mmCIF file of C-alpha atoms and ligand atoms in Angstrom:
data_model
loop_
_atom_site.group_PDB
_atom_site.id
_atom_site.type_symbol
_atom_site.label_atom_id
_atom_site.label_comp_id
_atom_site.label_asym_id
_atom_site.label_seq_id
_atom_site.Cartn_x
_atom_site.Cartn_y
_atom_site.Cartn_z
ATOM 1 C CA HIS A 1 134.148 50.595 -41.463
ATOM 2 C CA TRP A 2 135.235 47.954 -43.135
ATOM 3 C CA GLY A 3 137.083 45.166 -42.536
ATOM 4 C CA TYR A 4 136.903 41.122 -41.897
ATOM 5 C CA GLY A 5 136.391 41.930 -37.301
ATOM 6 C CA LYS A 6 133.870 40.018 -35.931
ATOM 7 C CA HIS A 7 132.073 43.408 -36.864
ATOM 8 C CA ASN A 8 132.912 44.413 -39.665
ATOM 9 C CA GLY A 9 133.192 41.870 -41.228
ATOM 10 C CA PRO A 10 131.438 40.451 -45.159
ATOM 11 C CA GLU A 11 127.441 40.713 -43.870
ATOM 12 C CA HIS A 12 128.093 44.268 -43.116
ATOM 13 C CA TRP A 13 128.989 45.602 -46.096
ATOM 14 C CA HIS A 14 126.518 45.259 -47.771
ATOM 15 C CA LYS A 15 124.871 48.037 -45.337
ATOM 16 C CA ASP A 16 127.564 50.610 -47.304
ATOM 17 C CA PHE A 17 128.284 48.980 -50.241
ATOM 18 C CA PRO A 18 124.413 47.906 -51.801
ATOM 19 C CA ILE A 19 126.544 45.662 -54.364
ATOM 20 C CA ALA A 20 127.689 43.426 -52.046
ATOM 21 C CA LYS A 21 123.957 41.301 -52.992
ATOM 22 C CA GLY A 22 124.111 42.314 -56.931
ATOM 23 C CA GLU A 23 124.259 39.822 -59.983
ATOM 24 C CA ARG A 24 127.823 39.279 -60.130
ATOM 25 C CA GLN A 25 129.696 38.661 -57.330
ATOM 26 C CA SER A 26 132.527 36.976 -56.420
ATOM 27 C CA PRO A 27 134.105 34.703 -54.903
ATOM 28 C CA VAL A 28 131.549 31.994 -55.859
ATOM 29 C CA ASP A 29 132.671 27.914 -55.301
ATOM 30 C CA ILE A 30 133.304 26.363 -57.716
ATOM 31 C CA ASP A 31 131.884 23.034 -58.998
ATOM 32 C CA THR A 32 133.411 20.857 -61.321
ATOM 33 C CA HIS A 33 130.493 18.637 -61.565
ATOM 34 C CA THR A 34 128.693 21.635 -63.299
ATOM 35 C CA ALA A 35 131.323 24.498 -64.819
ATOM 36 C CA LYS A 36 131.071 22.890 -68.329
ATOM 37 C CA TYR A 37 134.072 22.906 -70.947
ATOM 38 C CA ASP A 38 133.837 25.396 -73.557
ATOM 39 C CA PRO A 39 135.829 25.303 -76.498
ATOM 40 C CA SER A 40 135.259 29.388 -77.618
ATOM 41 C CA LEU A 41 138.279 29.540 -75.673
ATOM 42 C CA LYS A 42 141.801 30.141 -75.515
ATOM 43 C CA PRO A 43 145.584 29.882 -73.893
ATOM 44 C CA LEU A 44 145.693 32.189 -71.689
ATOM 45 C CA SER A 45 149.109 34.093 -72.836
ATOM 46 C CA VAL A 46 151.057 34.934 -69.799
ATOM 47 C CA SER A 47 153.686 37.450 -70.538
ATOM 48 C CA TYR A 48 155.227 38.613 -67.020
ATOM 49 C CA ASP A 49 159.303 38.536 -68.379
ATOM 50 C CA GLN A 50 159.632 42.561 -68.679
ATOM 51 C CA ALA A 51 157.529 42.645 -65.551
ATOM 52 C CA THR A 52 159.127 46.171 -62.014
ATOM 53 C CA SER A 53 158.046 45.354 -59.717
ATOM 54 C CA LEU A 54 158.095 48.611 -57.598
ATOM 55 C CA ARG A 55 156.563 48.852 -53.360
ATOM 56 C CA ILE A 56 154.900 46.419 -51.380
ATOM 57 C CA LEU A 57 152.757 48.215 -48.917
ATOM 58 C CA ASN A 58 150.752 46.744 -45.693
ATOM 59 C CA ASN A 59 146.581 48.861 -46.708
ATOM 60 C CA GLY A 60 145.491 47.286 -43.424
ATOM 61 C CA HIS A 61 143.452 44.064 -45.277
ATOM 62 C CA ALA A 62 146.090 42.372 -46.825
ATOM 63 C CA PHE A 63 150.073 43.937 -48.625
ATOM 64 C CA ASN A 64 149.542 44.857 -51.755
ATOM 65 C CA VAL A 65 152.907 44.120 -54.316
ATOM 66 C CA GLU A 66 152.916 46.704 -57.088
ATOM 67 C CA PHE A 67 153.486 47.011 -60.411
ATOM 68 C CA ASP A 68 154.659 50.338 -63.500
ATOM 69 C CA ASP A 69 151.788 49.224 -65.374
ATOM 70 C CA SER A 70 153.028 52.127 -67.895
ATOM 71 C CA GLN A 71 154.108 50.558 -70.164
ATOM 72 C CA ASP A 72 152.476 46.934 -71.560
ATOM 73 C CA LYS A 73 155.708 44.923 -69.784
ATOM 74 C CA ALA A 74 153.513 42.431 -67.576
ATOM 75 C CA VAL A 75 150.343 41.263 -69.600
ATOM 76 C CA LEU A 76 147.677 39.030 -69.468
ATOM 77 C CA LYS A 77 145.514 38.236 -73.118
ATOM 78 C CA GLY A 78 144.124 35.749 -73.659
ATOM 79 C CA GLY A 79 142.092 32.819 -71.910
ATOM 80 C CA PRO A 80 138.679 34.703 -72.573
ATOM 81 C CA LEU A 81 140.471 38.032 -73.216
ATOM 82 C CA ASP A 82 139.788 40.444 -75.651
ATOM 83 C CA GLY A 83 143.181 43.178 -75.295
ATOM 84 C CA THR A 84 145.979 43.954 -73.420
ATOM 85 C CA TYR A 85 145.622 43.418 -69.777
ATOM 86 C CA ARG A 86 147.861 44.948 -67.175
ATOM 87 C CA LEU A 87 149.505 44.037 -63.854
ATOM 88 C CA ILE A 88 149.110 46.704 -61.360
ATOM 89 C CA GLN A 89 149.569 44.220 -58.032
ATOM 90 C CA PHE A 90 149.326 41.528 -56.754
ATOM 91 C CA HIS A 91 147.186 40.716 -53.376
ATOM 92 C CA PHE A 92 146.815 37.001 -51.213
ATOM 93 C CA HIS A 93 144.507 35.688 -49.004
ATOM 94 C CA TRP A 94 144.738 33.372 -45.941
ATOM 95 C CA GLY A 95 143.172 32.013 -43.172
ATOM 96 C CA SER A 96 143.980 31.603 -39.012
ATOM 97 C CA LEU A 97 144.324 28.091 -40.011
ATOM 98 C CA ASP A 98 145.027 25.796 -42.720
ATOM 99 C CA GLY A 99 141.867 24.296 -44.037
ATOM 100 C CA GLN A 100 140.416 27.705 -44.366
ATOM 101 C CA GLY A 101 141.709 30.855 -46.211
ATOM 102 C CA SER A 102 140.655 30.820 -50.034
ATOM 103 C CA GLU A 103 138.127 32.995 -51.464
ATOM 104 C CA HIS A 104 136.999 31.037 -54.236
ATOM 105 C CA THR A 105 135.757 27.168 -53.382
ATOM 106 C CA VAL A 106 136.742 23.764 -55.510
ATOM 107 C CA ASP A 107 133.405 21.458 -54.204
ATOM 108 C CA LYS A 108 132.997 23.890 -51.116
ATOM 109 C CA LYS A 109 136.527 22.775 -50.709
ATOM 110 C CA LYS A 110 138.944 26.148 -49.333
ATOM 111 C CA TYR A 111 141.865 25.898 -49.460
ATOM 112 C CA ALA A 112 144.854 28.681 -47.109
ATOM 113 C CA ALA A 113 144.369 30.746 -48.802
ATOM 114 C CA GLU A 114 144.040 32.772 -52.153
ATOM 115 C CA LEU A 115 147.140 34.338 -54.641
ATOM 116 C CA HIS A 116 144.901 37.577 -57.279
ATOM 117 C CA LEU A 117 147.205 39.495 -59.618
ATOM 118 C CA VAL A 118 144.392 42.031 -60.830
ATOM 119 C CA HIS A 119 145.033 43.346 -64.538
ATOM 120 C CA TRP A 120 143.673 45.971 -66.137
ATOM 121 C CA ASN A 121 141.910 46.576 -69.442
ATOM 122 C CA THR A 122 144.739 48.868 -71.791
ATOM 123 C CA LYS A 123 141.481 51.106 -73.602
ATOM 124 C CA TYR A 124 140.431 51.877 -70.524
ATOM 125 C CA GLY A 125 143.005 53.845 -69.961
ATOM 126 C CA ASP A 126 143.375 54.082 -66.009
ATOM 127 C CA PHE A 127 142.384 51.065 -63.352
ATOM 128 C CA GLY A 128 140.584 53.761 -61.947
ATOM 129 C CA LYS A 129 138.019 53.978 -65.558
ATOM 130 C CA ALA A 130 138.786 50.252 -66.242
ATOM 131 C CA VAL A 131 136.866 49.854 -62.674
ATOM 132 C CA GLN A 132 133.237 51.062 -64.273
ATOM 133 C CA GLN A 133 133.354 49.294 -66.872
ATOM 134 C CA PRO A 134 132.248 45.494 -66.887
ATOM 135 C CA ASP A 135 135.201 43.791 -68.487
ATOM 136 C CA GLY A 136 137.774 46.508 -66.151
ATOM 137 C CA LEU A 137 140.067 43.647 -64.828
ATOM 138 C CA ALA A 138 141.015 40.401 -65.832
ATOM 139 C CA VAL A 139 141.626 38.499 -61.435
ATOM 140 C CA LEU A 140 144.913 35.844 -62.129
ATOM 141 C CA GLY A 141 143.367 33.317 -59.629
ATOM 142 C CA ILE A 142 145.989 31.701 -57.225
ATOM 143 C CA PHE A 143 145.559 28.271 -54.329
ATOM 144 C CA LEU A 144 147.568 27.707 -52.603
ATOM 145 C CA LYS A 145 147.960 24.398 -49.900
ATOM 146 C CA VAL A 146 149.915 23.887 -46.796
ATOM 147 C CA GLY A 147 153.105 21.211 -47.974
ATOM 148 C CA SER A 148 156.383 21.784 -48.970
ATOM 149 C CA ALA A 149 157.842 25.429 -49.801
ATOM 150 C CA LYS A 150 157.263 27.671 -52.732
ATOM 151 C CA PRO A 151 161.028 28.447 -53.277
ATOM 152 C CA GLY A 152 159.259 32.441 -55.622
ATOM 153 C CA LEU A 153 157.590 33.539 -52.195
ATOM 154 C CA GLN A 154 160.171 33.415 -50.218
ATOM 155 C CA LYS A 155 161.776 37.009 -50.649
ATOM 156 C CA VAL A 156 157.516 38.176 -50.593
ATOM 157 C CA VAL A 157 158.381 36.454 -46.386
ATOM 158 C CA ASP A 158 160.966 37.931 -45.709
ATOM 159 C CA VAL A 159 159.928 41.746 -46.646
ATOM 160 C CA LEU A 160 156.631 40.977 -44.351
ATOM 161 C CA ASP A 161 158.710 41.494 -40.423
ATOM 162 C CA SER A 162 159.194 45.686 -41.975
ATOM 163 C CA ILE A 163 155.211 46.378 -43.324
ATOM 164 C CA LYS A 164 154.081 44.650 -40.377
ATOM 165 C CA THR A 165 151.465 47.074 -39.896
ATOM 166 C CA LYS A 166 149.152 48.663 -42.009
ATOM 167 C CA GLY A 167 150.847 51.946 -44.343
ATOM 168 C CA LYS A 168 153.996 51.102 -43.912
ATOM 169 C CA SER A 169 155.940 50.335 -46.844
ATOM 170 C CA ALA A 170 159.133 49.074 -48.780
ATOM 171 C CA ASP A 171 161.237 49.333 -52.112
ATOM 172 C CA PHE A 172 160.638 45.766 -53.153
ATOM 173 C CA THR A 173 161.978 45.922 -56.753
ATOM 174 C CA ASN A 174 163.177 42.976 -59.258
ATOM 175 C CA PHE A 175 160.910 39.965 -58.392
ATOM 176 C CA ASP A 176 159.427 37.948 -60.428
ATOM 177 C CA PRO A 177 155.515 37.112 -60.379
ATOM 178 C CA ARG A 178 156.276 33.553 -62.224
ATOM 179 C CA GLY A 179 157.478 32.131 -59.511
ATOM 180 C CA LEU A 180 153.720 32.346 -57.819
ATOM 181 C CA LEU A 181 152.932 30.021 -60.946
ATOM 182 C CA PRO A 182 152.174 26.407 -60.591
ATOM 183 C CA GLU A 183 152.800 24.118 -63.843
ATOM 184 C CA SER A 184 149.088 24.422 -65.809
ATOM 185 C CA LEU A 185 147.698 27.186 -66.571
ATOM 186 C CA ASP A 186 144.152 24.801 -67.277
ATOM 187 C CA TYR A 187 141.445 27.732 -65.583
ATOM 188 C CA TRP A 188 137.704 28.441 -64.749
ATOM 189 C CA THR A 189 136.536 31.150 -65.642
ATOM 190 C CA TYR A 190 133.875 33.722 -64.452
ATOM 191 C CA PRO A 191 131.972 36.848 -64.722
ATOM 192 C CA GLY A 192 132.740 38.880 -61.094
ATOM 193 C CA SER A 193 133.430 41.102 -58.605
ATOM 194 C CA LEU A 194 136.100 43.701 -57.069
ATOM 195 C CA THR A 195 135.971 41.023 -53.597
ATOM 196 C CA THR A 196 137.017 43.262 -51.202
ATOM 197 C CA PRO A 197 134.938 46.557 -50.826
ATOM 198 C CA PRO A 198 133.714 48.672 -53.833
ATOM 199 C CA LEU A 199 132.660 45.286 -55.149
ATOM 200 C CA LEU A 200 132.291 46.702 -58.371
ATOM 201 C CA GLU A 201 130.960 44.093 -61.115
ATOM 202 C CA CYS A 202 134.031 44.712 -63.069
ATOM 203 C CA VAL A 203 136.446 41.650 -63.192
ATOM 204 C CA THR A 204 136.284 38.459 -65.588
ATOM 205 C CA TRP A 205 138.010 35.606 -63.504
ATOM 206 C CA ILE A 206 140.021 33.497 -64.267
ATOM 207 C CA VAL A 207 140.534 31.317 -60.953
ATOM 208 C CA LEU A 208 143.880 28.190 -62.117
ATOM 209 C CA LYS A 209 143.117 24.248 -61.373
ATOM 210 C CA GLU A 210 146.375 23.379 -60.174
ATOM 211 C CA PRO A 211 147.376 25.717 -56.075
ATOM 212 C CA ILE A 212 150.955 25.860 -55.291
ATOM 213 C CA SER A 213 152.098 24.663 -52.719
ATOM 214 C CA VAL A 214 153.344 26.826 -49.332
ATOM 215 C CA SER A 215 155.679 26.023 -46.453
ATOM 216 C CA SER A 216 154.213 25.595 -43.459
ATOM 217 C CA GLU A 217 156.731 28.619 -42.273
ATOM 218 C CA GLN A 218 156.218 31.188 -45.103
ATOM 219 C CA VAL A 219 151.759 31.166 -43.602
ATOM 220 C CA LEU A 220 153.116 30.731 -40.133
ATOM 221 C CA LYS A 221 154.726 34.198 -41.542
ATOM 222 C CA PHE A 222 151.824 35.659 -43.325
ATOM 223 C CA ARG A 223 149.851 35.353 -40.224
ATOM 224 C CA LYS A 224 152.301 37.887 -37.887
ATOM 225 C CA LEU A 225 151.804 40.292 -40.434
ATOM 226 C CA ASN A 226 148.783 43.507 -38.869
ATOM 227 C CA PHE A 227 145.423 44.259 -39.316
ATOM 228 C CA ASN A 228 146.391 48.039 -36.817
ATOM 229 C CA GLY A 229 148.434 51.329 -37.375
ATOM 230 C CA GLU A 230 152.043 51.036 -35.994
ATOM 231 C CA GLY A 231 151.737 52.240 -31.667
ATOM 232 C CA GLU A 232 147.810 51.231 -32.113
ATOM 233 C CA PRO A 233 146.777 47.472 -30.149
ATOM 234 C CA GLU A 234 147.611 44.227 -32.351
ATOM 235 C CA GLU A 235 145.926 42.494 -34.525
ATOM 236 C CA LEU A 236 146.657 39.942 -36.734
ATOM 237 C CA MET A 237 146.167 40.209 -40.035
ATOM 238 C CA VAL A 238 144.817 36.682 -40.442
ATOM 239 C CA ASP A 239 141.271 35.649 -42.421
ATOM 240 C CA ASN A 240 141.387 38.639 -44.853
ATOM 241 C CA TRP A 241 139.263 36.352 -47.293
ATOM 242 C CA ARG A 242 135.659 37.051 -48.455
ATOM 243 C CA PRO A 243 132.284 34.037 -48.209
ATOM 244 C CA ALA A 244 131.449 32.405 -51.450
ATOM 245 C CA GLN A 245 128.311 34.831 -52.379
ATOM 246 C CA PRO A 246 125.295 32.923 -55.117
ATOM 247 C CA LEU A 247 126.671 32.502 -58.951
ATOM 248 C CA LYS A 248 123.226 33.537 -59.528
ATOM 249 C CA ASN A 249 122.412 33.905 -63.840
ATOM 250 C CA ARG A 250 126.377 32.637 -64.602
ATOM 251 C CA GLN A 251 127.913 29.916 -65.755
ATOM 252 C CA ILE A 252 131.358 28.363 -65.067
ATOM 253 C CA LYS A 253 133.987 27.628 -68.110
ATOM 254 C CA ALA A 254 136.386 25.544 -68.132
ATOM 255 C CA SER A 255 139.748 25.397 -69.522
ATOM 256 C CA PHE A 256 140.602 21.842 -69.791
ATOM 257 C CA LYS A 257 138.013 19.102 -70.032
HETATM 258 CU CU1 CU B 1 136.499 51.996 -42.018
HETATM 259 CU CU1 CU B 2 141.974 39.448 -53.893
#
């Protein structure tokens, strides 16, 4: 009923999910000429040393690398956040062409892809309760450009053939998400939403300023995934991004001058 196809893409989502036209929808364009430095912010605290990855799953829309979130193992704190947010999963959005694929844009520039590290606020006890709260989630967004290979992404690339089609999963233990980060943790932040249905307005977005680079071969392997299930007509999993939504009555704040 929803996807990224010719007849069920983002422009249709509002019919089943009216909040698609809401006040706090994501992604947005980040205008670097109007986002204002905020001294009230802190540095991010990203604590992934004890992360326990479990599995990788093709959900028909993207693939999720899932983590054990039953203890404080991989957490995000600081920045704009109060309290402790636990990593549940990460996934990507990417294009069919190197000049599109990201959800956020920067001065209207689209990146080749965007990584979302999804975390939920432990005060709400589980993910499903968290998404019902305005401060339920914190998503760390990281842009990808094509250039040099990202070594810490290669284990993901090499498992993709095992999860080509919707509903496939594979063991994915002992993956270190620190290998997906850029050098700098400078960021922009604003209040927004999930970027897929149900489009809930439960997210504190933290979008890193510095992109990571991935190789053309790495991206090409992402583009071989399938939206479809096994034994169905092949539909390449590409262009699984929602475009920028109106900022409305929001301000984007920068952690950096
Ligand atoms: Cu459907
Ligand atoms: Cu996402």
